[PDB]
Amino acid sequence: VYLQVKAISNIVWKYQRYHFIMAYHEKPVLPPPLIILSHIVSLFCCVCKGPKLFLTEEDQKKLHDFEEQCVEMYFDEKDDKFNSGSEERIRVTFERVEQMSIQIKEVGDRVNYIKRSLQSLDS
Amino acid sequence: LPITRKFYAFYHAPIVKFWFNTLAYLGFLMLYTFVVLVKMEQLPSVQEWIVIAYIFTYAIEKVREVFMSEAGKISQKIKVWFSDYFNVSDTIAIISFFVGFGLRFGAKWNYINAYDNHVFVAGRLIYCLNIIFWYVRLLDFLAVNQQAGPYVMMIGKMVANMFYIVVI
Amino acid sequence: QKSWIESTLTKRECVYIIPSSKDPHRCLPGCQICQQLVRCFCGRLVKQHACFTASLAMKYSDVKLGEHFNQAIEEWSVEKHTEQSPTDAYGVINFQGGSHSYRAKYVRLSYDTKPEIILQLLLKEWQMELPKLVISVHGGMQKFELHPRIKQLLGKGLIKAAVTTGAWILTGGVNTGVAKHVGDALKEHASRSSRKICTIGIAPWGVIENRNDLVGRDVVAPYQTLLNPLSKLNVLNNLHSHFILVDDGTVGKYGAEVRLRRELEKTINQQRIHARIGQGVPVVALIFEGGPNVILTVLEYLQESPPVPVVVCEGTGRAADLLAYIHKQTEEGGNLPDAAEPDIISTIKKTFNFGQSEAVHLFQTMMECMKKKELITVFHIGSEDHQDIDVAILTALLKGTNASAFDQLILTLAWDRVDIAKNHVFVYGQQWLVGSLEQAMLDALVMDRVSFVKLLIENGVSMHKFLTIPRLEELYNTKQGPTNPMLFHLIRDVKQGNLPPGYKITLIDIGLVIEYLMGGTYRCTYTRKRFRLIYNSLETKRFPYPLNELLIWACLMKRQVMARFLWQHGEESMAKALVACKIYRSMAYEAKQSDLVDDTSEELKQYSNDFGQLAVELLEQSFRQDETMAMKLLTYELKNWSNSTCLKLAVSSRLRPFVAHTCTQMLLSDMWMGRLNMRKNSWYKVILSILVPPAILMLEYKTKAEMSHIPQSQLPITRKFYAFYHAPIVKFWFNTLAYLGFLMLYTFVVLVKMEQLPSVQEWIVIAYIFTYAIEKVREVFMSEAGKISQKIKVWFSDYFNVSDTIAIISFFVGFGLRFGAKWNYINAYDNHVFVAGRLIYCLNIIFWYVRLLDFLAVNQQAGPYVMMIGKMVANMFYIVVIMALVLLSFGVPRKAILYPHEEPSWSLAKDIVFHPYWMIFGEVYAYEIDVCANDSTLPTICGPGTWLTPFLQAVYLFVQYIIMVNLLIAFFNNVYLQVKAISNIVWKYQRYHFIMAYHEKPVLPPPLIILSHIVSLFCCVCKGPKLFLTEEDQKKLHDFEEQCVEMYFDEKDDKFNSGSEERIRVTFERVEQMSIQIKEVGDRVNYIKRSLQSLDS
Ligand SMILES: CCCCCCCC/C=C/CCCCCCCC(=O)O[C@@H](COC(=O)CCCCCCCCCCCCCCC)COP(=O)([O-])OCC[N+](C)(C)C
Ligand SMILES: CCCCCCCC/C=C/CCCCCCCC(=O)O[C@@H](COC(=O)CCCCCCCCCCCCCCC)COP(=O)([O-])OCC[N+](C)(C)C
Ligand SMILES: CCCCCCCC/C=C/CCCCCCCC(=O)O[C@@H](COC(=O)CCCCCCCCCCCCCCC)COP(=O)([O-])OCC[N+](C)(C)C
Ligand SMILES: CCCCCCCC/C=C/CCCCCCCC(=O)O[C@@H](COC(=O)CCCCCCCCCCCCCCC)COP(=O)([O-])OCC[N+](C)(C)C
Ligand SMILES: CCCCCCCC/C=C/CCCCCCCC(=O)O[C@@H](COC(=O)CCCCCCCCCCCCCCC)COP(=O)([O-])OCC[N+](C)(C)C
Ligand SMILES: CCCCCCCC/C=C\CCCCCCCC(=O)O[C@@H](COC(=O)CCCCCCCCCCCCCCC)COP(=O)([O-])OCC[N+](C)(C)C
Ligand SMILES: CCCCCCCC/C=C\CCCCCCCC(=O)O[C@@H](COC(=O)CCCCCCCCCCCCCCC)COP(=O)([O-])OCC[N+](C)(C)C
Ligand SMILES: CCCCCCCC/C=C\CCCCCCCC(=O)O[C@@H](COC(=O)CCCCCCCCCCCCCCC)COP(=O)([O-])OCC[N+](C)(C)C
Ligand SMILES: CCCCCCCC/C=C\CCCCCCCC(=O)O[C@@H](COC(=O)CCCCCCCCCCCCCCC)COP(=O)([O-])OCC[N+](C)(C)C
Ligand SMILES: CCCCCCCC/C=C\CCCCCCCC(=O)O[C@@H](COC(=O)CCCCCCCCCCCCCCC)COP(=O)([O-])OCC[N+](C)(C)C
Ligand SMILES: CCCCCCCC/C=C\CCCCCCCC(=O)O[C@@H](COC(=O)CCCCCCCCCCCCCCC)COP(=O)([O-])OCC[N+](C)(C)C
Ligand SMILES: C[C@@H]1CC[C@@]2(OC1)O[C@H]1C[C@H]3[C@@H]4CC=C5C[C@@H](OCCC(CO)CO)CC[C@]5(C)[C@H]4CC[C@]3(C)[C@H]1[C@@H]2C
Ligand SMILES: Oc1ccc2c3c1O[C@H]1c4oc5ccccc5c4C[C@@]4(O)[C@@H](C2)N(CC2CC2)CC[C@]314
C-alpha cells in the first residue's frame, strides 16, 4: 500500500485538493459555533427577498470551435508521432525496398532489350 | 478596493474559511478534552455548553450541506453524502453525542455521588467515546497538506483492505 | 442586433427590369414569352428578380415608361438600380463528398464594402492572423492542363511559402480558373498538416454554381463537390478555407471582384508586419497559365506605388510561358535591341487568336512590362533556378523593390527564414548603414530568433560593441517573446516595497535578484559602487564579457534555447553552466515554496540539471585532454563571478557528480595529505606520529617537484614537522584525539559528584569549550569574503554549527549557575541554582556526543549512514503528527473513563500521553489493562465503564504499533534505498566539506588552539583552493576550454549520428529518394527502347 500510494503521491493530493477546495467554497463565512448567525441571516434573505460557467449560445459556439480544432491537432500529432517511430520507418522501408527490387529487375530485364536490340541494329 | 470590501474579500475566501474553521475546531477539541478529563457536575460547565453548541450547529450545517447540495432527488443527495467516510463518522458522532447529552442532562440524581446514578454514567461514557470521532476528523484537516494527505489515504487503504488477514 | 456580419454587410438586388438588352423577343406568344425567356441586364429572368417591386413587375406592367427611351435602356447600373440590404448567405460550407467533407467560411457582400470592413471581417470575425505575406495567384480562368511533374513540383513550393510564413493565398475560388490547381497543391503534400494555410477565394456571387444552398443566416450549407469533371461550371474548390463572394446585384457576369481583391492587397500592405518591424505586409503575384487579361494585371501592378513583384511561372504556353519568353529576349534596360518583333508577334497569335491588331497592342503592353524586369521573376523548371519556387516567391520581395539592406534582413526575420537571409541578403553588394545589423540583433534577441543571432555574429556583429546598458535593459523589460512571470515577483521581493505601475526593470534590481538566487556571499557586479557610479551617470557603457550578461538574461527570462546558444559562445564556459544551474535551481525552489500549483518548478529544475550535466561532461572532456588544465579550471578565481571558483559554484548547487568527479577528488586528496605522501594506511601512521613525534621523520613526504603543480596550492628535519602538522589529515586526527579526550573527561565530570570548585577535569572541559567557541567566532569572520549578515546566514545553514552554538551558549549558562551559586547549604543539592547548572551540563553533553557523527562521517562507509539518519529525522514530521493524534485519541478516553473524579491539573497532560507513548514500543501494561480482574495491579480503579478500556487499547495498538510504526519504517526504508543507490557519490561530496574545513583550521586543537590564536593576531598587527592566474595563462586556459567545448559537441554529434534511430531515418529518407530515381530509370529506359524502335526503321 505504501509503495503504491507513494508512486502516485502528488497525483493523490491534487485530487484531494479538488474535494477540500470545493467543500470550503460552499461553506459559510462563520465556523460552527457562530455559524448560526450565517444560518439565521441567510434564510431570511431567501424568504424576505459551484465552479460552473454559464455561457451564451454565441460563446458556446466559439468554444466548440476551439474544441474541434484541438481534436484535429490531437490526431495530427498522434499520426506524426506514429509515422516518425522507428517501427513504422522499418516497415515502410521494408515494403519500399521490396518494390525497388522488382524495379531494378525491371531495369535488369529492360537493359537486355536495349543491348540485344543494339546488337540487332549493329547489323 | 476600499476598506469594507477587503474584509468581505478576506472572509469569503475559502482559504480563510478553512483556517477559521480549523482554529475553531481545535478550540472545540481542547474544551471537550477538558470536559471529559475533568469531573462532571450536575449542570454543564461553560466549557461543556460551548461544546454542545458547536456540535448542534455543526449538525445543522451538515443537514444544510445535504439539501443545498447538487440538484437532484433527495434519495440521491442522501446516498452521495453518505459515500464519504468522514460524513458517516460525523453522523454517528452527532447522533451519539445527543444520546449522551440526553442521558447526562435528563438524569435525575437520586444520589449525591453522581456515579451511583447509572443513567448519568452512561451519558458521560458516551462523551468519552464520542471524542474519538472528533480527534479522527482532524486527519481530514491535516490532509489539506501536500505531505500529510497521501499518508492519510494510505492508512485508509490499509484498514479497508486488511480484513482477510485479520480474519486469519 | 449584436451581429456584426448581418448588421454591417450588404446584399444587392436588381430592383429594375429593362428588357434583355434590346426589344424583349419575337415568337408570336409575344406577351407570353415575356415570362419564358425575357431577362434584364441584371442577368436574371423575370421570375428570378423576385424583388418586392419586381413582383409588381410580374402582375400588370414593369417599372418604366410606355415605350422606354434608349438612354434609359443604358441607364441600368449596379449603383443606382440595386437596393442594398442586410445579407443572407454566410456560414461554413460543408463540401459534402470531398475527403472528410472540408469546411470553409463564406459570405455574400457587395463590391462597395469599405476596405476596412473587409479587414475587420478577415481578422476580427473570422479570427484570422495578420499574415507575414500575401500571395495573389492569377491565371487562366478556363479549364486547362498541367504536366504531372510540374504539378507535384509547384505544390511543394507555393505551400512551403504559405506555410513557412503564414501567408494568405488569394484566388478566384471557382474551379474554372487557377484555383483548381491551387487545390491540387493543397490536396497533395497534405496542405497544412496541423500548420494552417489561409487561402481566400474572392469570387463573384452571380456565377457561383448552386448559389441557393449558401443562402441562410449563419447556416452550415452543404455543397455538392462531384459534378462532371470535364464540364466547366463555376463550382467552388473544396480545399480552400475562406470565400468572399463579391456581389454586384447580378447573375452571369464576372468582374465585380477585380477591385475588392486589389483593395484588400492595399489594405494588408498598409499593416505592420510585426510590433517592432516597421514595414508593411509584403504582397507578391503568381501567374499560372494566364489568359489575355492576366497580362494587363501584371502591368497594373508594376506601375503602382508601392509596386508589387510578379513571379511568372512557366509551362502551358500562354501568358505564363509568354512572359517567360520575352523576359529572356529584352535587354537589361528593357527594350528588345534586335529586330525580332514579327517573330514574337507570331508567337502571341499562336497563343491568342487575334490575327494582327490586338496581337501588337498585346505586345505593346509587354514592352512596358519589360521595362521593370527587376520586379519580374521567371522560375523555369528545367535548368532549376533558385532551387525552389518557395525561395523564388520570397526572394522576389527582396530584389527589385529597391529596399535597404536592413529592410531586406528584417523581413526574413519576421518570416523566420535564415536560409533566404544567408544566401540572398548576406552577399557582396550590400552596404549596411551604421547601426542596422545591431538593431537587427536586438530584434532577434528580443524575438528569440536564435538562428539569426548566430548568423549576425558570423556575418559581422560584435557583441562587445553591441551590448550596452540601455540595450540590455530593453531586453529585460520586453514582453515580445518567452517570458518568466516569476522575475517580476523576485524583483518585488528584493525591493521590499511595491513599485509604480509602469516600472521598467533596472540592472541594479537584476543584480539584487542574482544575489538572492546565488546566495551565500555572491555579489553581482551590478550592485557594486563602480557600476552604480556609472549607471547613475547614464567605452565605459559597454561590457567586457557580453555573453556572460546575456546568459544571465536568458536564464532569468526562462529562455533556454537562447541560453544554450549563448553558452557555447564566449569564454568561461564551465562557469556559465554552473551559474545557470544555480540560478534555475533557486528559481525552482522559489516556485516550489510558493502557493501556486503548477509545473514551473519541475521545468526549472530540469533546466538546472541540463546545465549541470553540461558542466560535468565538459569536465570529463577536459580531464581526458589534460588533467593539469582540468584541475586549473576547477580552481581559477572567477573575477566575473564574485571571485569564486567553479568548484565552489558546483557545491552551491548540490551538484554531486561534478564534485564526485575524479579530477575534483584528486584535487581534494592533495589538499588533505599536504606534503605527506603515504598511499596506504595513513590513519594510524598519522595517529602514532601525533603521539610519537619522532615517528614523523619515518613518514614519506612529497618532493617540491611534486608539490609544484597542485593547481589549488597557495627536506630537513624542521620542515618535516611543519609539513606534518599543517597537513589537514593531521589536523583532523589531532582534533579528533583531543575531542575524544574532551568527551571522556566531561563524561567523568557529570557522572562523578560535583563539588564547590571545579575539578581539574572540569576546568579542562571548560577551557576546551571556551576556546572552541573563540575558534567558531573566528571561522565566521575569517570565512568567505562578504557581508557579515551573509557570513552569519551561511554558517547557521549547517546543522552541527547550530548545534554547537546551542551547545556553547547552554554550557556557559550552566557554568555560570554552577560557579556563581552561593552555597547556603552543605548538601549542595539543596541549592537549586547549583542543581540547575549541573543538570544543564548533563543535557549539554548530548550535543557533544552527537557531534561525533560528523567526525565519523569522514569514513567512506559511515558517512552515508549519517546522511540517511538526518534525512529520516528531517522528513518524518507528518507521520509523527499522525501518530500523536492516534495517541491522544486513545489517551484521553482512557484517562477519562478510568479517572472520572479529577480536578484540573497538569498531571492530566502527563497521564494522557505517558502510557500511550510506551505502548508504541510494545509495553502493553498487561496487569493494568483490565482493572477489575483478580490479577490487576490497579484494583481501586475498578468502576463503571472500565470494561471499555481493553477494547480501546486493542484498537490503539493495532493502529499505532502495527500500522503507524511500520508506515514510519516504510518511509525510512525508502530513504535507505535512495541514499544507498548514490552512496559513493554522497561521501565524495561530504569529502569536499571536511577537507575544506580542516584546511582552514589551525594546527592546534581547541584546548591549545589559544596559542595559535594569540600568536596569529600578533603577526597581523605587528607585521581556499583558489588559483590566481596571470592574464597570459588565463588566456591559455580559455583556449583550452573552448577546444574541449568543440570536442564535446563533436562527440555528441557523432554519437547521435551513429545511433540506430538516426540511421533508420536517414535510410528511410534515402530509400524514398532512390525509389523515384529508379522510376526515373524505369521511365527513361522506355525513352531508350522506344527511340531504338524509332531508329530501328
Ligand atoms: C497549525 C496550528 C495552528 C494553531 C492552532 C491554535 C488553536 C487555537 C485554539 C484556541 C482556544 C483554546 C482554549 C480552549 C481550552 C480552554 C480550557 C481551559 O483552559 O479552561 C480553563 C480556563 O478557563 C476557562 O476556560 C473559563 C472560560 C469558560 C469557557 C471556555 C472559553 C475558553 C476559550 C475558548 C473560546 C472558544 C474557542 C472554540 C469555539 C468552538 C478553566 O480551568 P480551571 O480554571 O483550571 O478549572 C477550575 C478548576 N476548579 C474547579 C478546581 C477551580
Ligand atoms: C445529515 C445530517 C447529519 C447529522 C445528523 C443530524 C441529526 C442529529 C440528531 C440527533 C438526535 C439523536 C437522538 C437523541 C435522542 C436522545 C436520547 C436520550 O438521551 O434520551 C433521554 C433524554 O431524553 C430527552 O428528551 C431529554 C434530553 C433533552 C434532549 C436532548 C437530545 C435532543 C437534541 C438533539 C439535537 C440534534 C441536532 C440536529 C440538528 C440537525 C431519555 O432518558 P432520560 O430522560 O435520560 O432518562 C432518565 C431516567 N432517570 C430519571 C431514572 C435517571
Ligand atoms: C494546536 C494543536 C494542533 C496543531 C498541532 C501543532 C503542533 C505541530 C504540528 C502541526 C501539524 C500541522 C502542520 C500543518 C499546519 C501548519 C502550516 C501548514 O503547512 O499548513 C498546511 C495545511 O495545514 C493543515 O492542513 C493543518 C490542519 C490542522 C491540523 C491540526 C491537527 C494537527 C495536530 C494533531 C494532534 C497531534 C499533534 C499535536 C499535539 C496535540 C498548508 O501549508 P502550505 O504552507 O500551504 O504548504 C507548504 C508547501 N508549499 C510551500 C508548497 C506551499
Ligand atoms: C579511532 C579511535 C582512535 C583512538 C582514540 C583515543 C582517544 C585518546 C584520548 C585520551 C585521553 C583520555 C583521558 C580522559 C579521561 C580521564 C579521566 C580519568 O581517568 O580520571 C582519573 C585519572 O586522573 C586524572 O584524570 C587526574 C588528572 C586531572 C586532569 C585530567 C587530565 C587527563 C589526561 C587528559 C589530557 C587532556 C586530553 C583532552 C584535551 C581536551 C581520576 O579519577 P579518580 O582518581 O578515580 O578519582 C578520584 C576519586 N576519589 C575522589 C574518590 C578519590
Ligand atoms: C559564532 C560563534 C558560535 C559560538 C557562540 C559563541 C558565544 C558563546 C557565548 C556564551 C555566553 C552565553 C551567556 C552566558 C550567561 C551566563 C548566565 C548565568 O549563568 O548567569 C549567572 C552567573 O552569571 C555571572 O555573570 C557569573 C558567572 C561567571 C560568568 C560565566 C559565563 C560567561 C562566560 C561566557 C564565555 C563564552 C565564550 C565565547 C567566546 C567567543 C547569574 O546567576 P547566578 O550568579 O548563578 O545566581 C546566583 C544566585 N544565588 C547566589 C542565590 C545562588
Ligand atoms: C460514541 C460511542 C458510540 C458509537 C460507537 C460506534 C462504533 C464505531 C462505528 C462506526 C465507525 C465509523 C465508520 C463507519 C463505516 C465507514 C464507511 C466507509 O467505509 O466509507 C467509505 C466507503 O463506504 C461508503 O462510503 C459506504 C459505506 C457506509 C454506508 C453509509 C452509512 C450508513 C449508516 C451507518 C452504517 C455503516 C457502518 C457504521 C455503523 C455503526 C468511504 O470512503 P471515502 O472517504 O469516500 O473515500 C474517498 C474520499 N473522496 C471521495 C474524498 C476521495
Ligand atoms: C440511532 C439512535 C438510537 C438511540 C437513540 C436513543 C435511545 C434511548 C437511549 C437510552 C435511554 C435510557 C433511559 C433509561 C432506561 C431504563 C433504565 C433506567 O432508567 O436506568 C438504568 C439506565 O441504564 C442504562 O444503560 C442507560 C443508558 C442506556 C444507553 C445505552 C447505550 C445506547 C446509546 C449509544 C449511542 C447510540 C447512537 C448510535 C449512533 C448511530 C440504570 O440507571 P438508574 O436507574 O439511574 O440507576 C439504577 C441503578 N442503581 C440503583 C445502582 C442506581
Ligand atoms: C481508541 C483507539 C484509538 C483510535 C484509533 C485510531 C484512529 C483510527 C484511524 C484511522 C481512521 C480512518 C482514516 C480514514 C482516512 C480516509 C479514508 C477514505 O477516505 O476512505 C477509505 C476507507 O477508510 C476507512 O474505511 C477508514 C477505516 C474504517 C474504520 C476502522 C478504524 C480502525 C479500527 C480497526 C482496526 C482494529 C483491528 C483489531 C481490533 C482488535 C477508502 O479506501 P479504500 O476503499 O481502501 O480504497 C480502495 C480504492 N479502489 C477503488 C481503487 C479499490
Ligand atoms: C543543554 C540543555 C539546554 C538546551 C536544550 C535544547 C533542545 C534542543 C534544541 C535544538 C537542537 C539542535 C538542532 C536545531 C535545528 C537544526 C537546524 C537544521 O535543520 O539545520 C539544517 C537545515 O536548516 C538550517 O540549516 C537552518 C535552520 C536553523 C536556523 C538557524 C539557527 C537559528 C537559531 C536557532 C533556531 C533553530 C532551532 C533551534 C533552537 C532551539 C542544516 O542541515 P545541514 O547540516 O546543512 O545539511 C547539509 C550539510 N552539508 C552542507 C555539509 C552538505
Ligand atoms: C540565549 C541565552 C539565554 C539564557 C541566558 C542566561 C539567563 C540567566 C539564567 C538564569 C539565572 C538564574 C539566577 C537565579 C534567579 C532567581 C532565583 C534564585 O536565585 O533561586 C532559584 C533558582 O531557580 C532556577 O531555576 C535557577 C536556574 C534557572 C535557569 C533555567 C534554565 C535556563 C537556561 C537554559 C539554557 C538556555 C540556553 C539556550 C541556548 C540557546 C532557586 O535557587 P535558590 O534560591 O538557590 O534555592 C532556593 C530554594 N531552597 C530554599 C530549597 C534552597
Ligand atoms: C538523549 C536521547 C539520546 C539522543 C538522541 C540521539 C541523537 C540524535 C541523532 C541524530 C541527530 C541528527 C544527525 C544529523 C546528521 C546530519 C544531517 C544534515 O547534515 O542535515 C539534515 C538535517 O538533519 C537534521 O535536521 C537532524 C535532526 C534534527 C534534530 C532532531 C533529533 C531527533 C529527535 C526527534 C525524534 C524524537 C521524536 C519523538 C519524541 C517523543 C538535512 O537533511 P534533509 O533536509 O532531510 O535533506 C533533504 C534534501 N533535499 C534538499 C533534496 C530535499
Ligand atoms: C488538538 C489537541 C486537543 C487536546 C489537547 O491538546 C490539543 O487540548 C489541550 C487542552 C489542555 C488542558 C487545558 C487546561 C487545563 C487546565 C490546567 O489547570 C491549571 C493547573 C492547576 C494545578 O492544580 C492550577 O492550580 C491544567 C491543564 C489542563 C487540564 C490542560 C491539559 C492538556 C490539554 C487537555 C490539551 C490536550 C493535549
Ligand atoms: O587519485 C590520484 C591518482 C594519481 C595521482 C594523484 C591522485 O590524487 C592525488 C594524490 O592523492 C594522494 C593520497 C595519498 C598519497 C598520494 C596521493 C596523490 C598523488 C597525486 O598527487 C599525483 C598522482 N598527482 C601529482 C603528480 C604529478 C602527477 C596529483 C594527484 C594525486
Side-chain angles (χ1 to χ4, degrees), chain C residues 216-499:
Chain C
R217 295 288 189 283
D218 191 73
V219 65
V220 178
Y223 183 80
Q224 296 294 337
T225 187
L226 74 164
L227 296 172
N228 293 111
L230 281 71
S231 69
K232 73 288 193 185
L233 279 73
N234 289 312
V235 62
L236 296 174
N237 200 167
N238 52 354
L239 276 76
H240 293 82
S241 67
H242 297 88
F243 293 101
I244 296 167
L245 298 171
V246 178
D247 183 70
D248 57 358
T250 63
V251 174
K253 63 177 71 65
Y254 294 97
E257 69 279 14
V258 297
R259 184 176 64 79
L260 190 148
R261 186 173 175 178
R262 180 69 181 92
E263 291 294 328
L264 182 64
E265 294 177 354
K266 295 186 181 290
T267 305
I268 299 297
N269 207 153
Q270 297 293 319
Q271 299 289 318
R272 291 177 69 88
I273 191 164
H274 187 273
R276 294 178 66 90
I277 301 172
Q279 292 183 3
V281 177
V283 181
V284 64
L286 184 60
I287 303 300
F288 291 169
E289 186 164 353
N293 297 112
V294 176
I295 300 299
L296 190 149
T297 302
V298 176
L299 189 156
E300 191 269 330
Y301 289 159
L302 277 299
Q303 292 182 354
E304 291 176 350
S305 178
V308 176
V310 177
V311 178
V312 298
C313 80
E314 287 190 356
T316 70
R318 289 180 70 193
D321 278 340
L322 193 153
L323 294 174
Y325 183 77
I326 188 167
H327 185 274
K328 299 295 290 180
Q329 297 294 324
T330 303
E331 65 187 356
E332 293 80 0
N335 190 359
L336 192 158
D338 292 332
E341 184 173 2
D343 192 0
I344 189 165
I345 299 298
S346 67
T347 303
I348 290 168
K349 295 187 287 186
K350 292 193 267 83
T351 60
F352 295 101
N353 292 319
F354 293 164
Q356 189 271 329
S357 176
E358 293 292 329
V360 177
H361 188 195
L362 191 283
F363 182 78
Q364 293 299 107
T365 300
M366 293 173 176
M367 293 298 290
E368 293 184 354
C369 296
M370 295 297 103
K371 299 290 180 69
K372 293 182 184 291
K373 290 174 73 175
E374 68 277 16
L375 295 173
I376 297 166
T377 301
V378 177
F379 181 75
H380 63 274
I381 60 89
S383 176
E384 293 181 351
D385 188 1
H386 293 168
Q387 297 292 320
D388 191 353
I389 189 73
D390 179 80
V391 66
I393 296 164
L394 297 174
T395 305
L397 278 298
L398 279 295
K399 65 178 74 174
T401 62
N402 68 15
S404 176
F406 181 74
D407 291 326
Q408 290 185 7
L409 181 63
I410 192 72
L411 182 63
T412 60
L413 190 151
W415 293 345
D416 190 75
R417 296 292 301 274
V418 295
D419 59 353
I420 186 165
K422 187 175 177 182
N423 293 321
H424 297 285
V425 178
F426 291 105
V427 65
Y428 183 79
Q430 299 297 328
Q431 295 299 113
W432 295 117
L433 296 174
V434 296
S436 67
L437 290 169
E438 289 183 353
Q439 184 65 46
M441 182 62 79
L442 184 63
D443 294 331
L445 293 171
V446 171
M447 293 174 65
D448 198 70
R449 296 287 183 269
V450 175
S451 65
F452 291 85
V453 173
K454 184 176 173 65
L455 185 65
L456 275 299
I457 293 166
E458 295 175 352
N459 296 109
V461 177
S462 176
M463 300 303 290
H464 297 276
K465 293 181 177 181
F466 177 70
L467 196 277
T468 64
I469 294 167
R471 291 180 180 174
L472 181 61
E473 288 187 351
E474 181 169 359
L475 291 171
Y476 286 102
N477 283 309
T478 186
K479 295 185 285 184
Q480 295 180 0
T483 55
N484 191 4
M486 183 184 290
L487 182 62
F488 181 77
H489 295 291
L490 291 171
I491 295 164
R492 184 180 61 79
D493 292 330
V494 299
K495 291 175 76 68
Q496 293 179 359
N498 288 317
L499 47 83

Side-chain angles (χ1 to χ4, degrees), chain A residues 15-16 19, chain B residues 79-93 96-97 125-131 133 140 153 160:
Chain A
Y15 184 82
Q16 291 174 353
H19 294 286
Chain B
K79 290 179 181 67
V80 171
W81 183 79
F82 288 99
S83 68
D84 184 6
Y85 178 73
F86 291 108
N87 291 330
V88 175
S89 299
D90 286 331
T91 303
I92 298 165
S96 67
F97 182 77
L125 292 171
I126 290 164
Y127 287 181
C128 297
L129 297 174
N130 209 151
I131 198 168
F133 292 101
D140 186 69
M153 179 169 174

Side-chain angles (χ1 to χ4, degrees), chain B residues 19 22 26 141 144-145, chain C residues 592-595 877 881 884-885 888:
Chain B
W19 288 109
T22 301
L26 292 169
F141 291 92
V144 167
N145 190 345
Chain C
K592 186 177 176 180
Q593 295 298 111
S594 69
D595 292 328
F877 181 73
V881 173
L885 184 283
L888 293 171

Side-chain angles (χ1 to χ4, degrees), chain C residues 193-205:
Chain C
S193 296
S194 182
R195 194 172 166 87
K196 64 178 74 66
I197 299 163
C198 291
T199 180
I200 301 169
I202 299 94
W205 180 257

Side-chain angles (χ1 to χ4, degrees), chain C residues 673-684:
Chain C
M673 294 300 291
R675 188 174 173 87
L676 296 175
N677 200 7
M678 287 78 74
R679 294 175 68 91
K680 294 187 283 186
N681 299 122
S682 296
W683 62 275
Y684 64 79

